[PDB]
Amino acid sequence: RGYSFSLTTFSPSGKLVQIEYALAAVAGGAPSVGIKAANGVVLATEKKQKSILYDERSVHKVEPITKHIGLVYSGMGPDYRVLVHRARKLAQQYYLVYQEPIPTAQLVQRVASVMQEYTQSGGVRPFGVSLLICGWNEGRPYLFQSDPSGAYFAWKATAMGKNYVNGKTFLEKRYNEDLELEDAIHTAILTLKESFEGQMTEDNIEVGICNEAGFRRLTPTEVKDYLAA
Amino acid sequence: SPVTEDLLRKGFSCVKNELLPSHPLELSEKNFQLNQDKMNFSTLRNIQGLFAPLKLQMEFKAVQQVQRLPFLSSSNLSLDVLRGNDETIGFEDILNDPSQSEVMGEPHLMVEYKLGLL
Amino acid sequence: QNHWFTYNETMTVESVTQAVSNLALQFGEPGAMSRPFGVALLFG
Amino acid sequence: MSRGSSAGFDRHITIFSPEGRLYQVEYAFKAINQGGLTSVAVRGKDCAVIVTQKKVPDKLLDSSTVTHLFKITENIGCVMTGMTADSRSQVQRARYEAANWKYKYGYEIPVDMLCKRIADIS
Amino acid sequence: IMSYNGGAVMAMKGKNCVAIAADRRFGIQAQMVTTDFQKIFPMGDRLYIGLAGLATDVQTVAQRLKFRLNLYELKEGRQIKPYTLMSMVANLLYEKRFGPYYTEPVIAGLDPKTFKPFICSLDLIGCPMVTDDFVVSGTCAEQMYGMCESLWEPNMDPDHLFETISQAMLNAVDRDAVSGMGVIVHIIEKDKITTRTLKARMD
Amino acid sequence: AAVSVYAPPVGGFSFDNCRRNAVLEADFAKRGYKLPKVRKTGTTIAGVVYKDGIVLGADTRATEGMVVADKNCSKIHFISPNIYCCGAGTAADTDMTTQLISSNLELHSLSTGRLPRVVTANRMLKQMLFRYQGYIGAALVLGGVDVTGPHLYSIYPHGSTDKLPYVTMGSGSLAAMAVFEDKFRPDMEEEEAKNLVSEAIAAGIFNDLGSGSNIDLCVISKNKLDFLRPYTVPNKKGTRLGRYRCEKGTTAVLTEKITPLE
Amino acid sequence: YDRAITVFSPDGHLFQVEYAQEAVKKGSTAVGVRGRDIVVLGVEKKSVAKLQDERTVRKICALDDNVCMAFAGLTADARIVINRARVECQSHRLTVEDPVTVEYITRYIASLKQRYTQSNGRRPFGISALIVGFDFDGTPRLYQTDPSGTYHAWKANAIGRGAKSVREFLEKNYTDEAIETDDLTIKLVIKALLEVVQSGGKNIELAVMRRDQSLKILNPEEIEKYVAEIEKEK
Amino acid sequence: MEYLIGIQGPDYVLVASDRVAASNIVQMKDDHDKMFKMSEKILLLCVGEAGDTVQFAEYIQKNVQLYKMRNGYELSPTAAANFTRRNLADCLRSRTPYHVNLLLAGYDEHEGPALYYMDYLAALAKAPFAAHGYGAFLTLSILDRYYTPTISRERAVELLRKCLEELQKRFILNLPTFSVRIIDKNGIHDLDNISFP
Amino acid sequence: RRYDSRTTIFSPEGRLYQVEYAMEAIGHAGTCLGILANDGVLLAAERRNIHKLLDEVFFSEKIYKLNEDMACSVAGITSDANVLTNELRLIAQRYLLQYQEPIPCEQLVTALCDIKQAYTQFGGKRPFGVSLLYIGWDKHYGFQLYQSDPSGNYGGWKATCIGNNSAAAVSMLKQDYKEGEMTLKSALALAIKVLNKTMDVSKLSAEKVEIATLTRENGKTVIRVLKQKEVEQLIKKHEEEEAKAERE
Questions:
Q1: Do B96 and E98 touch (CB under 8 A)?
Q2: Which residues get modified to N6-acetyllysine (chain D)?
Q3: Which residue of B has its CA nearest to E90?
Q4: How many domains does chain A have?
Q5: Active-site residue numbers of F?
């Protein structure tokens, strides 16, 4: 198709081939699950570092921002660190002025705009990545998901990533609101178990909660305790 | 020192005091990124060779021309990690942030000036 | 007219044909042109 | 640039595949084996020994200027593998970045920051 | 330089009530050209600002602050907390620290959620500070601390608050050539705003 | 929008006032009019290095000339979990020039996963202050414990730096630092260090005009961060003898408007 | 050999200009004729669209108290050109205290059009103008721009789709007698425009301009009255 | 130096002036209209430093016609004032040590007349009767003494005549004759010049 | 034809094919009403996202608020509307900073259409895919409504319908509009009837529509969004009226 191969041209039906291709690419990645509960939120994901040659420290997925915002990627590894650094810089830029921490929504809008800015231009590829971010403001929990083109949604139980349709179908019959983190973590673990190609181990889960204390990331032994329980 | 060899579009600026600098922190604030880049380029050209400044500056030129049109705010997500100011927040973004510009020009005029046609 | 103002004398036809041809020579790669001037003149 | 980007699903970096794979970077991964080398680095508990391989194409070439083990800082090394013409530039870039960091923060860099800076600028 | 014009503003924190008052006069040094010149701006609903100093910069800073406040209010959705405007004006003034403005703003209002009275102040170039009992700034700064320190009292009802803010200004601002001839009193209780105009010596 | 704009606006410190400011100042200097002033809060700051951690402290008076503008103004800021600074003179500038470095160090700490080191803060402050050659004055006392050991610094408003075991900067500082010179000994204890710094700051507050009211201390020991405010009240205001409150109807009224909100 | 402005053909025939002309020859028509002391600038409205309001959609734009404007083609480019012409007129009046002549402003518009034909990164402005107005010396003037770079001091020409028929009708009837009084010019222009349009009065707009009385559009009642008067042919 | 006054009323913004020129010790011309016209309902008086006044007035006058010609309708006096003040402030602080005084006028169709006083540092008041120049000192008290809150158009001319007679009798300079213009809801009316033999 | 690879080339017949193709993008968005009445200016909407795992957000997802009176509704690629609405807010606030009056409609619609068109003349950037519908009040022309276009062809429409199934909705609106005499309640009833006539006929609910009004009263223009329970009774009344068709 001649109308493809370039993101600046519309196909003669109304679409953008490159954007859909990038969406399929980020779909073809690593599964991730996010659950919103009346008390807090939980973000669960697994890593490809299965072999013992790798290390638990150093490289890490769920990088916190400030104290109330935490994210997780489900796309290309070397293609979200720059985005994360930009998000932290934007949070600090907002913090120097308006001497009070960033609310989630403004950060979502700004990161969505900066991500979209590499769509309308010509000659640079869109970011292949799609990331959830969780916040806790005004005594309320917030969950959002970002798309390669950039369109935030007020999602509640998204299981986007590899084989995300099965995760969505499984989650559409378990979540019922009015839950604490104790059951939410188990639900997320079950959702990951539904499609993992193997058994969960002590060094394959990177759950991180965002209760009304901050963005504590669960220690490996604590994850072992929950996995056993 | 130039002679004439539209005043409504650009007017009300006497020749008297642009060749008379203001408060001495004028040439060190109006042109800061350019001076820092020039100093770094000179240092690299002196100590490492002639390849590094040419390569780095032409990389700057290559990455500069993919932003949005001038009459809209530029994200500038790239060119920043390459410049080295990836996390060096300072008195350049919290004071008079260009996103909330108090005055704004015409789109066609600004883009045609950016192209240098005028 | 600029030459008259500068040197305070009249033009010589070669001295203006040279100038106009030099201007028209700029075809190629700044309000620079991009196509040859599809025109022709008979200076007299 | 007045030459354009070659049309094709795998002929340029900024074009995604129909399934969503960057074929140019995969070709880049395949390109390391073109030169032909092997490097092994093992860390124990108090040492960080690095071993590599050296091949002399002929006899006339000197044996002292063909090393593939450069030095970045006073106490950091590298075992660069692949095309020499690009490692010879990444080494200089890393040296400049290390010097800049030492000037801006006044202590020797942890390995993670140098690795991250190189990864980002790549 | 805050003598080319005139101005004086107070702020007292009572019991769920805040009061802000100013002086109406605009004149070129000795001469006087008008008697009505507002120096109190209705930013928000239960919030107010009290710019006082050189007028030609008062107008500009008020316009810019109103613009930025509208932008933030529209973008972020809900109203602005009183503490945020403090850093707002601090940033706006430090924007031109080297080319300084000439304003000594006073901010006084209520929290839209807690209804806890709040009062702050600012210097010429922006240096945030909060005083619990009261604050005052203006051209006639010296001849108000003495009047206010003794007359003040904690935990005051609105009526006594109005009486005190009237007595700390009406006979304390006439002891100066410039910045006289009229006093506006703004009392901001919990539910309804109320404005009053006193009468003073016409000299 | 506008019809006389070519280039996009550029942020940073604006300078479109000095041309008018100079001529206005020349006009108003010879006519004996009022002159602008800033909160030149000349305050005493003290710091000592005892056996385990560091102790800081400063007075809490903020003047703007010959009039006491404030009676309670914190002279101790927050930079990191285990680094504190102090300000002296032109508090408006020192607040921002400390907050900026605090945010930069927070970004660095978030990107590194480990606690920052004091030398980084010193380097950044030195670079910024020397970049703005003069025209911005904020004498600082930077102290904090790190992974190596206790540290202390004495940044000047031109870029100079030192590594003294004790330092006293500000308008009124000679009294406190002379008390230090007389009483200080190496390798003291915690409570003794607190008593010594309190005594020095008390001498400085009494024997000077630019300082007054309460004092505070900022013990930042290795595994315990403390922030005591206020620590001691040396002076207490008396009481008003006669009631001078005015009753209802005391003041007149000309016009009145009532508007109900919701 | 037609994929870039800068390139030519083996014979010549700069093709992007010709394609722009073809695009211009697709919009609503437009006419104009000068008299003793009068100018008319009638146009025709392609669709009624009673839900739409005729106030916003219009073609007869004002450029000055002595110069008016009527275009044909893509709307946005014409609006941009009119804005630039207004700004240039005001700037020239500021720099010289003299009301601008028609020729100067029409030359400026032609130059602005021609500037966007010198690099294969900017498409040309595809529109056609009918600049007409009164000079400072009182002599009636009329012009007509062209997408490429050209302009002619026409007398009673026309543009838009189906312009050959109306041009022939105008040239077969234009005489000094028909330009003597005021309403005779209106009768002539209405008779000219009545050809291409299906039914008159419904979607025909005029703009009568007199000596320094400024532009004055005509309400539908006057148009209906003029059509009724011109319907007395025998 | 010069002289500018303007008195308000129920439905008029009557303004006077001083048709005169300036030089070292010489009067170049005895009739120099200072009254630039903005629109059919707005005047703009301007006295200041030579050259800068006629330049700034010209620039600010070939900018209000643009708005009318680009939007069909016409500005309002309040918008005109809040625009002129902004332009004056931005331009004066930019690079030029200007010295210009202005006195706007105008009559809209919703709230009576409107007269605005502006100094040379770009302030903005709404006084009911202001003055400029040096004659302000000697004439503002006379204007304030007889100024009933409501003044008929007939009596406004008489009040102006008295206020100008006092200035012509007690002033150092030789302002020989004055111009008078009154604005109503019919355009820009004109009155016969005030000339003292 | 082959003359559509780049958005800078004409056609032998004469047409910009790229913008014509982009015109079809707004054909895959929810419908948008917005008929004009005598007093208020009603503005309906449509929420495509009707999934069971979406949390509510303030001010719906389509209706916005520009400065104090004017709203907008978007359609098409939503990833390019958050920039236009932000820049339009900025231009309105900038005009207010310049002149201290509420902005008229033209100095906003034309201002945004300028940028929207300018991205169609400097090839190297794809044009915005949007169909912004405007609304507002002023003191110069009363109440009026405008409808935009990706190329930029804004017209002072009195009642229109952008998005999918626009042809049938527009035609039936044209055939059933009481021009001249029009009330807010009757306008709302007509809007409900139009929405029921269009769409896949799912009988609608409070979880599929959004309604905004512009009632001006007490000299202070206000914008209000009807509550979730404020439309169920309206739908019930419309259903009762439809069922009360008698016949035989």
A1: no
A2: 102, 104
A3: B95
A4: 1
A5: 43
